[PDB]
mmCIF file of C-alpha atoms and ligand atoms in Angstrom:
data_model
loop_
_atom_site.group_PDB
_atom_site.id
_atom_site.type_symbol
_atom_site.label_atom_id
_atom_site.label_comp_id
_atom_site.label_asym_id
_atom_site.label_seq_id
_atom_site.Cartn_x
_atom_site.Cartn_y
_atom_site.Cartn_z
ATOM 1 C CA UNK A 13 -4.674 18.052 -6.258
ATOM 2 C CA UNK A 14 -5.447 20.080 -9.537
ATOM 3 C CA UNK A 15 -1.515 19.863 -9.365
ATOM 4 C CA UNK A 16 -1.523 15.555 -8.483
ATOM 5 C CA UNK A 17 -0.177 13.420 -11.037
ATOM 6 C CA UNK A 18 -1.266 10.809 -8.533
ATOM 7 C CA UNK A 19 0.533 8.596 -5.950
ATOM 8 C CA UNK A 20 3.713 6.304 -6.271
ATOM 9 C CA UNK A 21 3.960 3.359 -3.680
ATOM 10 C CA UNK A 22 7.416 2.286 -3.497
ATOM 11 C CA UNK A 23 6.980 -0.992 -1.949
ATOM 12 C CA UNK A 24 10.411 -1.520 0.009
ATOM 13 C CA UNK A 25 11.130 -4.926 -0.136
ATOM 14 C CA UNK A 26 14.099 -6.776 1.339
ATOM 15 C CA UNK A 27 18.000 -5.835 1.655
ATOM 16 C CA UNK A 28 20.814 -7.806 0.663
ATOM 17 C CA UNK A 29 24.027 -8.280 2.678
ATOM 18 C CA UNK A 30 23.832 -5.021 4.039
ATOM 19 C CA UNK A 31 26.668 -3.584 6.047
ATOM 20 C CA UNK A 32 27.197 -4.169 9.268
ATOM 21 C CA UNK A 33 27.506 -1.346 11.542
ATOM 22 C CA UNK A 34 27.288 -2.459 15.141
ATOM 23 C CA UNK A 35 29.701 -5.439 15.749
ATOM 24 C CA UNK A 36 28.518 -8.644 14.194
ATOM 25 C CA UNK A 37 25.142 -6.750 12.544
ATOM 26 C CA UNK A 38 22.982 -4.089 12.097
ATOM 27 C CA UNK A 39 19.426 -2.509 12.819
ATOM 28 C CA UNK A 40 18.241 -1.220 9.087
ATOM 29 C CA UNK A 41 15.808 1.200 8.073
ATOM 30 C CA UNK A 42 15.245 2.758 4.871
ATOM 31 C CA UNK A 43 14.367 6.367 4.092
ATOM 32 C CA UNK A 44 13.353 7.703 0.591
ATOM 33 C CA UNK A 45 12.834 11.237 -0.108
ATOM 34 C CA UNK A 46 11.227 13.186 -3.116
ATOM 35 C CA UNK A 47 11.494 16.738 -3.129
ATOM 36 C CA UNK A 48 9.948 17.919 -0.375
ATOM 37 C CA UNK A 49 8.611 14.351 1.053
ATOM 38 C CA UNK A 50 10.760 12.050 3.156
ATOM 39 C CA UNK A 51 9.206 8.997 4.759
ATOM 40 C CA UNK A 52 10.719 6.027 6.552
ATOM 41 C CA UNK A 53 10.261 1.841 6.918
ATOM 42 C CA UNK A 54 10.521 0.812 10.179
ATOM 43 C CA UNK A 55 13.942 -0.607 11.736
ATOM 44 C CA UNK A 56 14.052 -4.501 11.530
ATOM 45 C CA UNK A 57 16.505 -5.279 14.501
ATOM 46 C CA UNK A 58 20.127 -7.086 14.102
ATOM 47 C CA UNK A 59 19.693 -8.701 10.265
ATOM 48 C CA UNK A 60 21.466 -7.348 7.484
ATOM 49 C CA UNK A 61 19.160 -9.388 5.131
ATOM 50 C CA UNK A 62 15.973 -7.479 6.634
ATOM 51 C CA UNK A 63 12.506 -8.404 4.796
ATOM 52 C CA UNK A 64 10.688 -4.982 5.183
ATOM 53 C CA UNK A 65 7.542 -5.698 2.839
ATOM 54 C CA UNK A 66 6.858 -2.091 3.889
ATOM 55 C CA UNK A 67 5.094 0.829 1.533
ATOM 56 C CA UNK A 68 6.482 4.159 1.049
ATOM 57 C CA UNK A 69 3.375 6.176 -1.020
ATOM 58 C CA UNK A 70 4.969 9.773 -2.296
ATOM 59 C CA UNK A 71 2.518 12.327 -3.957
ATOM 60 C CA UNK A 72 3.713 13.071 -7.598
ATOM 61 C CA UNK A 73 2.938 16.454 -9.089
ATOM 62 C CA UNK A 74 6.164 16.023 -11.581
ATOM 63 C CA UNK A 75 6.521 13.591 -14.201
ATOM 64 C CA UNK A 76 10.774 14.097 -13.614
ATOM 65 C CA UNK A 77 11.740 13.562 -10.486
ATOM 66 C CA UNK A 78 14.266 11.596 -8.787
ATOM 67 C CA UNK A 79 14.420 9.371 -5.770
ATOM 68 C CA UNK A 80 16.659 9.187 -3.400
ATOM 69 C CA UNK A 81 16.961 6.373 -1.075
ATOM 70 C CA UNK A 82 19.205 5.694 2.128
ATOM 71 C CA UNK A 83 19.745 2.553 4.529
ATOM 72 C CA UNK A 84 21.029 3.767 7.910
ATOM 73 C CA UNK A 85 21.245 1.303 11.122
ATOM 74 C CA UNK A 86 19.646 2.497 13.965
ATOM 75 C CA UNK A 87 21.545 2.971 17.016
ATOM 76 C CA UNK A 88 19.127 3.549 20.208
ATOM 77 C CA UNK A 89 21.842 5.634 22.265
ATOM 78 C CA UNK A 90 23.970 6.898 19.240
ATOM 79 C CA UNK A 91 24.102 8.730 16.074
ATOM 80 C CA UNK A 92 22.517 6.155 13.499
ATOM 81 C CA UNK A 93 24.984 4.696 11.280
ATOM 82 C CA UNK A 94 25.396 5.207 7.575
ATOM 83 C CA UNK A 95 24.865 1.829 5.548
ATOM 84 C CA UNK A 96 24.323 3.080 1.920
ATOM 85 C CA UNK A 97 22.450 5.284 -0.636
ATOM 86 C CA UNK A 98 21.363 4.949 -4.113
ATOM 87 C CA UNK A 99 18.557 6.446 -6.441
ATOM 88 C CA UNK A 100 15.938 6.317 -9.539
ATOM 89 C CA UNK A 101 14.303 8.128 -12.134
ATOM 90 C CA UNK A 102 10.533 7.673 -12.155
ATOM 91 C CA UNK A 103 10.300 9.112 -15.813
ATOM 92 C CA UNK A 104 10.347 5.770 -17.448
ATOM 93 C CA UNK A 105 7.766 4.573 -15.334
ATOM 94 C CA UNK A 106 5.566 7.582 -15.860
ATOM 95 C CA UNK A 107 6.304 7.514 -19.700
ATOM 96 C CA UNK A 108 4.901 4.117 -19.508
ATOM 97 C CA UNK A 109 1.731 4.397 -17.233
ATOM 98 C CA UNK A 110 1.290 6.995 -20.429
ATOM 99 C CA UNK A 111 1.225 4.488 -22.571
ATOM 100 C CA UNK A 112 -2.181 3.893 -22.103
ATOM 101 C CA UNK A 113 -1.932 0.580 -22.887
ATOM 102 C CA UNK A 114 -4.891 -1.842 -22.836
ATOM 103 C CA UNK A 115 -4.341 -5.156 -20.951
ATOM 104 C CA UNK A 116 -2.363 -6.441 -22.445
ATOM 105 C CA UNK A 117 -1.753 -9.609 -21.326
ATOM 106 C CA UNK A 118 -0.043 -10.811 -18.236
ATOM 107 C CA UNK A 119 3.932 -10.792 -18.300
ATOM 108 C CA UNK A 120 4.685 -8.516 -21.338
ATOM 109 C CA UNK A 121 7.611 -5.753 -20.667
ATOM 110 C CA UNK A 122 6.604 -2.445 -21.614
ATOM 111 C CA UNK A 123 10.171 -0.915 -21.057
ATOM 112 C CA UNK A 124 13.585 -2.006 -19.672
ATOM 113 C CA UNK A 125 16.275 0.607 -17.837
ATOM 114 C CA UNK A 126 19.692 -1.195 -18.335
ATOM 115 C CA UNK A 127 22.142 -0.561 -15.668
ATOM 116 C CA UNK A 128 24.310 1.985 -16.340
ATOM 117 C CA UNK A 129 27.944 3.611 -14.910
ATOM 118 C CA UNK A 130 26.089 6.181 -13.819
ATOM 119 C CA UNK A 131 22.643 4.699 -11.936
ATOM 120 C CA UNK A 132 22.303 2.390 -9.247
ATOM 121 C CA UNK A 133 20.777 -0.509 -10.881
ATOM 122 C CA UNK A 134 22.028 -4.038 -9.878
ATOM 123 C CA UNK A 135 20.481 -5.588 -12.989
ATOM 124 C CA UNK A 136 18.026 -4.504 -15.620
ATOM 125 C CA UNK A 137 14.418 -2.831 -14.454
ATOM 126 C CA UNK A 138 11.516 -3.903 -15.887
ATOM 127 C CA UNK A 139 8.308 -2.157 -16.202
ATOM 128 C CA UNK A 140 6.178 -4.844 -16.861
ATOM 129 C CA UNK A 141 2.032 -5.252 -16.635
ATOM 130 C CA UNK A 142 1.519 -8.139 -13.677
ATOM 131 C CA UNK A 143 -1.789 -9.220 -12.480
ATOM 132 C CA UNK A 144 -3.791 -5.859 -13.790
ATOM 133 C CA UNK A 145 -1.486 -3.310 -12.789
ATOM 134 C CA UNK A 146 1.867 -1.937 -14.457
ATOM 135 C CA UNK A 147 4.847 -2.355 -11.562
ATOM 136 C CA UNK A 148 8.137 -1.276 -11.874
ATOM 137 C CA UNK A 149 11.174 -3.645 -10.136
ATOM 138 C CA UNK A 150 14.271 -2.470 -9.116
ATOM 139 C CA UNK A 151 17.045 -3.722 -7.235
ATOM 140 C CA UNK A 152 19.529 -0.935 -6.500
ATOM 141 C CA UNK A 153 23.332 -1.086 -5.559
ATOM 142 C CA UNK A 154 24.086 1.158 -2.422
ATOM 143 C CA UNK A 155 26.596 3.868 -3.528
ATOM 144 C CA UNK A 156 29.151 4.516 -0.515
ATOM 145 C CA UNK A 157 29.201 1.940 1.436
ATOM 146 C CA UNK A 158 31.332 -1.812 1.093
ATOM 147 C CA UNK A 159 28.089 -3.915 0.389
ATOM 148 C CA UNK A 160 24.454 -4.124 0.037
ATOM 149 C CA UNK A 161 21.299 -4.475 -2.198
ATOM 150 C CA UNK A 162 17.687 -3.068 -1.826
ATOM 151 C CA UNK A 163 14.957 -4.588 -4.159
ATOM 152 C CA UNK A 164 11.749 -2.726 -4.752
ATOM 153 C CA UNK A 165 8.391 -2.193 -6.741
ATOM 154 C CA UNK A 166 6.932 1.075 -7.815
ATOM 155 C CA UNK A 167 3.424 1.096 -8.440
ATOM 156 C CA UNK A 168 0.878 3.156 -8.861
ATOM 157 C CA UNK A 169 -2.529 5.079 -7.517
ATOM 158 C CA UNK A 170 -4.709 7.067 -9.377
ATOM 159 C CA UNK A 171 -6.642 9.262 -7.802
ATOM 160 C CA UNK A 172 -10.293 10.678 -9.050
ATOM 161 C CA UNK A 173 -10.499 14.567 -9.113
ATOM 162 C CA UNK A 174 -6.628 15.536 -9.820
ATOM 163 C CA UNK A 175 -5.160 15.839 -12.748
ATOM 164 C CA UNK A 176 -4.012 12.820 -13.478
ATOM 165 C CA UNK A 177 -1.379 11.660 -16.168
ATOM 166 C CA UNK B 13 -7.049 20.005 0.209
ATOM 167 C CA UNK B 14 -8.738 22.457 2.547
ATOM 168 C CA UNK B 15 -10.787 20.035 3.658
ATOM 169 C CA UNK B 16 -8.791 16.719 3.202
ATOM 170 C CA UNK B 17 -7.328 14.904 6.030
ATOM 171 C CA UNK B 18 -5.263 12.605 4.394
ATOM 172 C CA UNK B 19 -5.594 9.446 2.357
ATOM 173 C CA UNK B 20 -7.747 6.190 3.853
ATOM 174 C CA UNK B 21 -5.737 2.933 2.738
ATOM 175 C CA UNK B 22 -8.412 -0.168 2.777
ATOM 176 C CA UNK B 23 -6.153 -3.232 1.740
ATOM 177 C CA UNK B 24 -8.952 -5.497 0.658
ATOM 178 C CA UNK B 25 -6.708 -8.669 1.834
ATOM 179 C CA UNK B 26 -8.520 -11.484 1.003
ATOM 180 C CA UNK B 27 -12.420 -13.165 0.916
ATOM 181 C CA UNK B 28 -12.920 -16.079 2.703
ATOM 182 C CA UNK B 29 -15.833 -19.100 1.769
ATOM 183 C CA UNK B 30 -17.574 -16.780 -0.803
ATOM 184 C CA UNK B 31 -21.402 -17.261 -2.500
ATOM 185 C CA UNK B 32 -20.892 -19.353 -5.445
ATOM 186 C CA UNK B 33 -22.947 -17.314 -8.176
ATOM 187 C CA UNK B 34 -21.779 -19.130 -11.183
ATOM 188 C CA UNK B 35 -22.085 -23.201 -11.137
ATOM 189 C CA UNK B 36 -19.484 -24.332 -9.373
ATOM 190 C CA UNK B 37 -17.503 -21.040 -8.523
ATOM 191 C CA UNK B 38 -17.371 -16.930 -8.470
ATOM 192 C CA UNK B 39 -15.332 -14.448 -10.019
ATOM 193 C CA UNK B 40 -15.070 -11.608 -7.281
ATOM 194 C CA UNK B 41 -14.702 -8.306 -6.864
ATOM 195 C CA UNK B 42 -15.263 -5.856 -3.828
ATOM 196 C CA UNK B 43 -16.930 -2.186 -4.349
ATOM 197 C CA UNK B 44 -16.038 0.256 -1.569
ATOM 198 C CA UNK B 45 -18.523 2.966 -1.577
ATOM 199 C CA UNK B 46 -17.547 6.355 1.119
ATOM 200 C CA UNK B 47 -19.675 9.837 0.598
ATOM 201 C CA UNK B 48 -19.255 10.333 -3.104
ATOM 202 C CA UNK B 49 -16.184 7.696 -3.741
ATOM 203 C CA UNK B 50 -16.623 4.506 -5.197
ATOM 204 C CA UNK B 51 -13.602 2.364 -5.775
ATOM 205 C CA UNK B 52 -13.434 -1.129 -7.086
ATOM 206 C CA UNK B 53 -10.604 -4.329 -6.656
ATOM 207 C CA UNK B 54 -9.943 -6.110 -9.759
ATOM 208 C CA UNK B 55 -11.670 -9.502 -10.452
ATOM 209 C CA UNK B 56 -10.108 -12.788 -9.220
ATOM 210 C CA UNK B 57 -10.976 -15.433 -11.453
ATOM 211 C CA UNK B 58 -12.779 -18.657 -10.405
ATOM 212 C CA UNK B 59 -12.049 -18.739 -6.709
ATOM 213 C CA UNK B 60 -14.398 -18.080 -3.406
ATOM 214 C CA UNK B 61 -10.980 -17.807 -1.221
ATOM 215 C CA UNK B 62 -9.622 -14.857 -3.555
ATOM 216 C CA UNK B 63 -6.257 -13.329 -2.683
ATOM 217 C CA UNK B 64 -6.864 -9.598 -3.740
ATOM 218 C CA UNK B 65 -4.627 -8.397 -1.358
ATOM 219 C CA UNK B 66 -5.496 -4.977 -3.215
ATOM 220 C CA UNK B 67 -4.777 -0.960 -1.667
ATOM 221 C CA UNK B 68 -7.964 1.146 -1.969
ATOM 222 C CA UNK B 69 -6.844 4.495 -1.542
ATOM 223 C CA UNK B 70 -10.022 6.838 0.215
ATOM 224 C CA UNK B 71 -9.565 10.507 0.305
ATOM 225 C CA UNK B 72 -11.311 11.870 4.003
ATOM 226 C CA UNK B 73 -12.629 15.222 4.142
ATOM 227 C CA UNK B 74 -15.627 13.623 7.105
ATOM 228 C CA UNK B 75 -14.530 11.459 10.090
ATOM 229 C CA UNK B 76 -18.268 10.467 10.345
ATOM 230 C CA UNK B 77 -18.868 8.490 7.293
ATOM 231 C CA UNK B 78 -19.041 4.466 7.030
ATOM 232 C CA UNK B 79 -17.327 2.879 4.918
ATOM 233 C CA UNK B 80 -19.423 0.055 2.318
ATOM 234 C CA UNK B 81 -17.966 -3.033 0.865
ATOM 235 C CA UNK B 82 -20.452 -4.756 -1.226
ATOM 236 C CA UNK B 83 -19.019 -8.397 -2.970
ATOM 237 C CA UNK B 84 -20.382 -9.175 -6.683
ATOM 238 C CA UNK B 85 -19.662 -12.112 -9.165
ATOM 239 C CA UNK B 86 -18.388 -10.933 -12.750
ATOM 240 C CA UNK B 87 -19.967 -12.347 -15.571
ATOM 241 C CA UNK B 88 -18.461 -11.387 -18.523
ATOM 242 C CA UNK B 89 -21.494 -11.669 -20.675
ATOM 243 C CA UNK B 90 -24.197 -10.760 -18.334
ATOM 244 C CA UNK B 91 -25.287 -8.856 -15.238
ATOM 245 C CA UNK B 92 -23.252 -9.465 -12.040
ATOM 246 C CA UNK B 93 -24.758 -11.623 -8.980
ATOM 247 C CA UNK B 94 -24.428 -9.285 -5.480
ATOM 248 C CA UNK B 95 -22.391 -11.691 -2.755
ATOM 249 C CA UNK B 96 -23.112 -10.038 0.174
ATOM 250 C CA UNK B 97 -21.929 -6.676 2.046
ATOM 251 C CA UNK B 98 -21.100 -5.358 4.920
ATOM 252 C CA UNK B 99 -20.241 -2.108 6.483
ATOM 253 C CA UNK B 100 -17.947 -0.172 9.393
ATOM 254 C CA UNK B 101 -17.399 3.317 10.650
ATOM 255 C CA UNK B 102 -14.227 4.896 10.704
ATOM 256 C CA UNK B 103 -14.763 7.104 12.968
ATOM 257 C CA UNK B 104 -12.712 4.927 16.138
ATOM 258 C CA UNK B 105 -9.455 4.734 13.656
ATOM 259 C CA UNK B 106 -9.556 8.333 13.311
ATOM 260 C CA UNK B 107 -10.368 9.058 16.562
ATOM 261 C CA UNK B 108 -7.171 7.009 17.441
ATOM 262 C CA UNK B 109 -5.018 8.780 14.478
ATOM 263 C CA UNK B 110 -5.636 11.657 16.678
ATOM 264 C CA UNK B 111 -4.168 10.743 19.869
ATOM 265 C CA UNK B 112 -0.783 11.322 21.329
ATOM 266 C CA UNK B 113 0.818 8.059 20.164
ATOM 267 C CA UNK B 114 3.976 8.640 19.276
ATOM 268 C CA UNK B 115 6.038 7.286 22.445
ATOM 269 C CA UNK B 116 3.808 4.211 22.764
ATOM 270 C CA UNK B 117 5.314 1.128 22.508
ATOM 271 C CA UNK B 118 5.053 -0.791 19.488
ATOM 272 C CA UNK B 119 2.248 -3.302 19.595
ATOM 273 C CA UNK B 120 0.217 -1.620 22.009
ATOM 274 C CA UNK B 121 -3.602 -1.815 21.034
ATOM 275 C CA UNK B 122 -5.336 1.869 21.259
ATOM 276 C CA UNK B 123 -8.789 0.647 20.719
ATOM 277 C CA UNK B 124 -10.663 -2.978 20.619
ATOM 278 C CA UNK B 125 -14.072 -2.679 18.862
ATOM 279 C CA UNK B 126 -16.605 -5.483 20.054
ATOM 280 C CA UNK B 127 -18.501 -7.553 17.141
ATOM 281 C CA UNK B 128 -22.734 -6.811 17.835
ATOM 282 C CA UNK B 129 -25.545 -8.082 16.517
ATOM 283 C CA UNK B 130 -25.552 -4.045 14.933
ATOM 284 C CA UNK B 131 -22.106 -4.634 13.050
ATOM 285 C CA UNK B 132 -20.459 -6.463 10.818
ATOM 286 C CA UNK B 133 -17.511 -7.591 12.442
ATOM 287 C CA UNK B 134 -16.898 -11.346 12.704
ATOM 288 C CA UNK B 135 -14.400 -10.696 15.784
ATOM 289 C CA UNK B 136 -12.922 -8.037 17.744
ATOM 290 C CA UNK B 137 -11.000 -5.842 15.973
ATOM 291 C CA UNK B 138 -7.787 -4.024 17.068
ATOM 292 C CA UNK B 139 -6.797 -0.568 16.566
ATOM 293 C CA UNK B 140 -3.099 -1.022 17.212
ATOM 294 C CA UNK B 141 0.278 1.022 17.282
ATOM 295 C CA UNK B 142 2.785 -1.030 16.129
ATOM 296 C CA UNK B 143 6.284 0.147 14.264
ATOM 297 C CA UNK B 144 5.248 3.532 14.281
ATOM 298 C CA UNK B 145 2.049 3.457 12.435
ATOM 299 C CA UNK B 146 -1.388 3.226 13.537
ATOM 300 C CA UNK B 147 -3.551 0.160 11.970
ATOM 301 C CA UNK B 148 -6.758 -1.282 12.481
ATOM 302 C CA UNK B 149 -7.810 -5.163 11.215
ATOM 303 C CA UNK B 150 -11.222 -5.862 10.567
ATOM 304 C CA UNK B 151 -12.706 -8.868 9.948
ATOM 305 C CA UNK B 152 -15.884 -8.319 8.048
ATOM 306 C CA UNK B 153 -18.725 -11.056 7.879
ATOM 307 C CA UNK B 154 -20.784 -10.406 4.612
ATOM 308 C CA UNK B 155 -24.765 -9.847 5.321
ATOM 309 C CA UNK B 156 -27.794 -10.367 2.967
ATOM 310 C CA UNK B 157 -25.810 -13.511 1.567
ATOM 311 C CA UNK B 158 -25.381 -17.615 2.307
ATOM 312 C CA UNK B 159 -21.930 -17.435 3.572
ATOM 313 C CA UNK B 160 -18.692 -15.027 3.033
ATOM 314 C CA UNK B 161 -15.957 -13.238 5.316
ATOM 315 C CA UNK B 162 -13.768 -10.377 3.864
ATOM 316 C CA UNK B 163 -10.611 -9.279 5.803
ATOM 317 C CA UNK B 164 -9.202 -5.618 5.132
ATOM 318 C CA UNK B 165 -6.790 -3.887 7.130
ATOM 319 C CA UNK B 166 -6.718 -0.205 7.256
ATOM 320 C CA UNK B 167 -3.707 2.235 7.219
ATOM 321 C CA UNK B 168 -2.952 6.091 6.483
ATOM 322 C CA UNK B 169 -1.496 8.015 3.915
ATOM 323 C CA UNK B 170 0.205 11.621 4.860
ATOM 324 C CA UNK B 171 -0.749 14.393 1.969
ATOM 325 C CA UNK B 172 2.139 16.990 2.097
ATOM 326 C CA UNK B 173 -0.729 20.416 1.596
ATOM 327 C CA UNK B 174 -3.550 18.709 3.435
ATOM 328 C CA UNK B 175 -5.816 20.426 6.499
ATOM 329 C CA UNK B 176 -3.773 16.962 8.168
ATOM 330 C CA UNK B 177 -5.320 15.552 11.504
HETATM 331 CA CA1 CA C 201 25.739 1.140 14.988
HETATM 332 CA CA1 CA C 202 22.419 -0.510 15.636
HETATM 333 CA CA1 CA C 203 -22.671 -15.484 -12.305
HETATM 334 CA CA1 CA C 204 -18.908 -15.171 -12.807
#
């Protein structure tokens, strides 16, 4: 808390032709994990186009960190099956909330992350100020696997008595 | 932290048939007001139905306290018209939090709290379980005001170093 940067919600939105890893589909959940936190979506049942619209809120004491972030398809009466993994930086995003920048109107792109040989991004990543709050988007290629997309959007919570930014 | 339970999430979803406190309209906002915290949605511009659909994040150090919402009309220029409040305890969501719910099925309700001419719910709300998380909806009906409805949903945040549940 004297140590909290303050909260990032990565809001887990959808995957995108996913693999399938029963027969004809798949059961997909996502798990993210930040140094020492992991959390979880919940499993959206034979749809490898699942529409999780689910929040993942990490506590951030480190302006440097990465993300990692996994798909597996859950198998009731089996090992869970691997279906992808990929990552981010939240640096940029950080750097930006840093900004301080004063609305600011509406729309306007504070920074772009170009994809890159070497991160997971499907297409460029804005971090742009929408409706009173500065978001982040991302859709990120799974590494490993034959196909598959998950879009998200980091935003973020401040919270009154840590340290802050 | 040595007190803290975790994080409170009030997603202030939407109001419904709000005062009109300018001529023809409002320009809302909701206040949430907990023991010492005061935290505040952004304004929605001209419209009673507004669509905050906005994450106030509580700390809880004291399962006893009620939770505030108060409703006021920005003016830019001048003082801000009050458009009703209203009020709940969270005492029955923690309560619930508390139980051994894990192994539930998903969708099973925990706890159904009763509207009375004592609170400010405009019908029952349901503590439920449902994929793996424990939620309560509240529909809130606005006091000391012509008309008004605010619906917020509640939900919990872990804090990795917290006194936890
Ligand atoms: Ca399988
Ligand atoms: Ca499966
Ligand atoms: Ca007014
Ligand atoms: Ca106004």
């Amino acid at each position: 808390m004297d140590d909290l940067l303050g909260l990032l919600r990565i809001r887990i939105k959808r995957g995108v032709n996913l693999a399938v890893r029963d027969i004809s589909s798949s059961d997909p959940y996502v798990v993210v994990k930040m140094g020492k936190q992991k959390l979880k979506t919940r499993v959206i049942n034979k749809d490898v186009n699942p529409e999780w619209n689910e929040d993942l809120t990490l506590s951030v004491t480190d302006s440097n960190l990465t993300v990692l972030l996994t798909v597996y398809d859950h198998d009731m009466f089996s090992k869970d099956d691997k279906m992808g993994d990929a990552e981010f930086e939240i640096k940029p995003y950080i750097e930006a909330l840093r900004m301080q920048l004063d609305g600011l109107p509406s729309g306007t792109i504070v920074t772009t992350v170009k994809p890159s040989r070497r991160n997971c991004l499907a297409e460029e990543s804005r971090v742009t100020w929408v409706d009173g709050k500065l978001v982040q988007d991302l859709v990120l290629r799974l590494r490993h696997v034959e196909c598959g997309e998950v879009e998200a959007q980091l935003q973020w919570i401040d919270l009154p008595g840590s340290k802050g930014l």
